[PDB]
């Protein structure tokens, strides 16, 4: 989880 919010 990358702040504010992106899925890896």
Given at each position: ?8
């Amino acid at each position: 989880l990358d702040p504010p919010x992106r899925w890896k």
